[model samples]
Target: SRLDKFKQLLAGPNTDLEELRRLSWSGIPKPVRPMTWKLLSGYLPANVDRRPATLQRKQKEYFAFIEHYHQDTYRQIHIDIPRMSPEALILQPKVTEIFERILFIWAIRHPASGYVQGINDLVTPFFVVFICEYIETVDVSGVPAEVLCNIEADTYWCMSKLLDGIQDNYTFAQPGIQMKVKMLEELVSRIDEQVHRHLDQHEVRYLQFAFRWMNNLLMREVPLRCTIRLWDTYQSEPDGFSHFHLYVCAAFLVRWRKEILEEKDFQELLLFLQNLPTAHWDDEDISLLLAEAYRLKFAF
Candidate 1:
């Protein structure tokens, strides 16, 4: 039933954006996620006929900026991209080059935010998802450079679209992130004052660990597999990346309330949170996390 609904919604020349977001709220099938995300992020035109020309022009435009902005500042991006460690195909030379260009152009164009470390984490999911369109494989070693560039351009556009809603988070002093962290603290206090008080009693600050959650949208906290499923719901929600994210972080903390309360030591508590045992988190865990986040969103 879900797959049928998605097909009907995506089949027609005129895509139903609102309907698409609704269908996408729970999860998107792997076969269609590339185009679905492209549409959901507002990167693809609802008028399907226009997409080819639009993509052709836009994809070329991405390289246009890349060629011009090649004279740039990516010392930090260079460090963090590798610092992200080696994912299957991500460690490949070509993929890293693609990642470098995408971040480089984004920094040069935005100019204000520059390239933040967490921003580097934002690109992989987009790249890997789009590469799905070509083939269900991460080993793009033998894939043509043109195909790689196309995937690169799409990833660049989609991630930039995502950044649009949360741009201020990466700006000077990250006022947006600080504000969100504050909001999360207030939210935790409201939803689970016990957890809030415990954290406070331990002299814990939300800014310490929550900052990464906001900055990278929890990319660091969860595995990429889980992050993809989480973002499905996010792309569907209005202001999901910014406003709704506070709820997600609240529930995530509440998920660990027992463990957090057990650890009375500040260093142990912070260490546990920073190194949360979410490495085994999968789609099922993310689905439950979103359900909890939804309850908290309306609970207050």
Candidate 2:
């Protein structure tokens, strides 16, 4: 019954699922199958097949754990120590102490991962939103705190593994992160590989368009409402979520194909993609896009 309730809520009123299933990512209604779309994004429907409650509880704990971890990240990435003047000393130490306390808690929770660089950059936005007490508390970053926190199901740990599997493209040091930038470059290039060549000639890397997917895990680019739907599935279905991201990438390309294909230069394409605004589109648009993504398979 709960599952059915969820289905009704996600499928909503106007969805013609049977017909939409007949369409592509760009053809399905934006809101036609939100729950199903979310399921694809990674949230496993709990009513049917599900993990143990204890596992779910651990997922909740992981969300709590990211708060302290994020506090440190906020201080490091957004808060500038050296930039502070002597008059601001009182607030500076207080901020640092609070963040350290947060990090200390995270260290205890995830002894295996400990602290890693670049995380602070990733976590600061969460501190800004979920922590409520903006002057003090922070939002849990983009991913579900539960999803991020579960050391066993820890998305971050898993993401690290995923990143490692493609280490040649991503390591930030020496030959690091090249693989990452390269992958994005390739993705963007498919839209117009020559655009990348032009940008390279101008000494610009295409980090601006796709860093969020790799670094922030699609936080900055995707709409928050859409994000919530996406995470509903990501918690339990990693493969499906990965595929969904690719599908959305496909959707974006299709949406922008006219401009992307017409653009003679790469910088123009980069700016166009970096500043996409799809919130105005109706639910049918999103649902259709997702449904279409589900329907089609990409060729290499």
Candidate 3:
């Protein structure tokens, strides 16, 4: 059912947005649209100021980070794959480049948060989707291999702004992430006390299912293609995210609530979440649930 609706939406008139969903790749595949791609990358179509200084500076820093990160144990642990399929490894270099770029963005945005381990998990969905669809569309025709196009530079700039808004929350040394999770637990308990008790009866914890959701903004949990749609929707609007993301969580519970209440242990709950096909959920149905949540104006 979830997949059916997703397919329908992809085939519907919303194809463009669907293709770029939040940041996912969808559709039959086309060369990146020149105009749109330029905007996302950050080119202004005309040069201003000292190009030489900017180019030399970024070139130096980008290479340095790549060298340092390539040798770093932290990056090696998360990204290494042994005897990997050729298909899986082909994109590793670009993925690593973008991943490091984002981390570099994070470092610039929040020097305190400077590269951390868990953030890579958060960036995987974006990396996967880009390599799958976005990079090839990069307006690289005339650009030198070493220089980022204007729009390419902007994506990082905008991404940095976005991370700056949320990084403090999830960065290693803060209560931002933990506090959000704890608050979410309290809110869920308040919104559905019976459900909370049932979960407690089964010793089910949201941590097991929700850790990746929160960690990656739902990227790791949702299918890569569908994740693009969600991101597209996210980019299209603002307030709705509080509803959309959380409602999907509620929708997952709707499927398993009864089973959870009947089952009486953590293992059963974990089994349900582990096997949950979160991408197959009906977005409209989930939206309604989230709307109800918004009406309640429950704080979290």
Candidate 4:
């Protein structure tokens, strides 16, 4: 049924994006991910014919600058790319420069969230999914030079659309992040006061760790594979990046309520939250989290 809805919607000359969102809220089939993501991001038009024209112009124009970024920003991005997420991807050749260019341009253009550290983690999932459409892995070292540029451009633009939803998250003072963290605290308190009290008794400040959940979109807690799956649901919800993400964080925190309550002390509680044992998480894990997130959303 999931694959059927996606196939049926994608069948038309122009897609019904609302229906697409409803279907995408569950899961997007892997082979369909790149095209689906582009359409969902509003980077690609629903009208099939206009697709070629728009993709060409947008992708081409992004690079004529081949060559533009604040050198200071460039310096910062260059330093960060080597250490950025999905360590497998960064280990390869050509990946760093592409990341460098994307982050450099994004920071230069936005001026708001100028090259913040955790935002780098946000880009990796998009890049991985887009490039995987062709090669199925992060070994982009020897892919067609022509192919890489198109993927890089697409990733850059689509990610900007995502960032657009939460521009305040990266801006000076990052008030959006604080507001979401606070909301998460309040939501958690209402959902189950015991978990909230346990965290409070241990002196666990929501701001301490939840800020990264908002900034990195859980890319730091779970592996990149799972983040891709989590974002599928986020992309489907209205203002999912900025709005629904808080519920996901709420659901995420409560998912480990038992372990969290067991931690018993501020230092241990903070350590567990900081280094959550999600390495074995799968897409199903995200599925359950989104389900609880949706329940929390409606219950509230």
TM-score of each: 0.96, 0.47, 0.59, 0.96
Evaluated against the true structure, the overall lDDT of model 2 is 0.43
Q: What C-alpha lDDT does candidate 3 achieve relative to the native structure?
A: 0.48
Candidate 1 residue lDDT tens string, 1-300? 777888788876899899899889899998889888988998889887898999999999987887776344677777777657446666777888888889988888887898777888899889878887776436876677899888889999999999999978998888998899998988899999999998889998988899888888898888887888888889999988878788999989999989999999999999988878998888889889999999999997
Clashes of each: 0, 38, 13, 1
**Native-to-model Cα distance after best TM-score fit, residue 42 in candidate 4, in Å:** 0.5
Q: Which candidate achieves the best lDDT against the true structure? A: 4
Show where candidate 1 strays beyond 4 Å: 70-72
> For residue 1, what is the lDDT in candidate 2?
49
The positional error of residue 244 in candidate 3, measured at the CA in angstroms, is: 6.6
* Model 2 misplacement above 4 A: 1-74, 77-206, 233-238, 241-244, 264-268, 295-298
How high is the lDDT of residue 58 in model 3?
52
lDDT of 2 by residue, 131-228 (tens): 23212322233444333333223333333333333333323342434444565456655655555555566555555665545444455565544544
Candidate-wise lDDT, in order = 0.86, 0.43, 0.48, 0.87
Best to worst by lDDT, what's the order? 4, 1, 3, 2
In candidate 3, stretches whose alpha carbon ends up further than 4 angstroms from where it belongs are 1-92, 121-155, 239-252, 279-300
Tens-place lDDT digits, model 3, residues 167-280: 555566555556545655766687667777777677667776666555556655555445544544444334333334554455445546676676666775677666655657
Per-residue lDDT of model 4, residues 161-206, tens digit only: 9999988888999998899999999999999899999888888999
How many clashes show up in model 3? Answer: 13
Q: What's the TM for model 2? A: 0.47
RMSD of each: 1.5, 9.7, 8.5, 1.4
